[PDB]
Symmetry: C3
Subunit: 88 residues, 3 copies
């Protein structure tokens, strides 16, 4: 299971860099990247306490966002759902 936490952190670093690249080249808006970066905060916390499922879903969302595949509203929705689901 340490292997999966390792993988999750690898993807978090990768997608965090992808967000910054696609912000710099103008493909994404600042608000979108800020909201995705808040999900990245949740994934980091999820990784800490072992919540693989929350972390994995958060990463899927951040990847979808970095690739312009989901909306600002969908990112805000997923963030609230993920934060609350991490609380349990």
């Amino acid at each position: 299971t340490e292997e999966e936490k390792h993988h999750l952190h690898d993807d978090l670093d990768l997608l965090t860099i992808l967000l910054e690249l696609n912000l710099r080249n103008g493909k994404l808006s600042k608000e979108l990247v800020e909201e995705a970066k808040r999900i990245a905060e949740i994934v980091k916390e999820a990784i800490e306490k072992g919540a693989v499922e929350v972390a994995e879903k958060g990463l899927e969302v951040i990847d979808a966002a970095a690739h312009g595949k989901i909306s600002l509203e969908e990112v805000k929705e997923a963030r609230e759902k993920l934060k609350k689901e991490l609380e349990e």
Copy 2:
């Protein structure tokens, strides 16, 4: 599928690495442009489930990003790869 997921991770990674090594002057624009065409072939080979084409395409991109394959060799690899997809 674990493999498709890994393939997508590597295409993200190598897309970033290619720009990094263009911007710091390590790679020529023309090499990076040819590698970016291979990355399109990988993006497709992933979507299409042609995993071996995806994996070889990423190996060529990685070699290109590290300056380990010549411009002519990248051009030839892309031809061999594009054909191998169809």
Copy 3:
């Protein structure tokens, strides 16, 4: 690790590519210093050789140090210390 298989070596190389990028990202935005990155790159050179030679444990250790450095979590003095230890452990 899972042994010095081609699959593990390939994973270690992915991580090194990823951390190569992160060091530059975080040098450029001012998070990391030039001397920190230079020392981290000397660990990256040790990691490279370790990956080649199948020394997955030495490589995983250098990657963990480089990662901790890139996130601003260990001091320049710790990175230098880690580089000396890792070069010897190899």
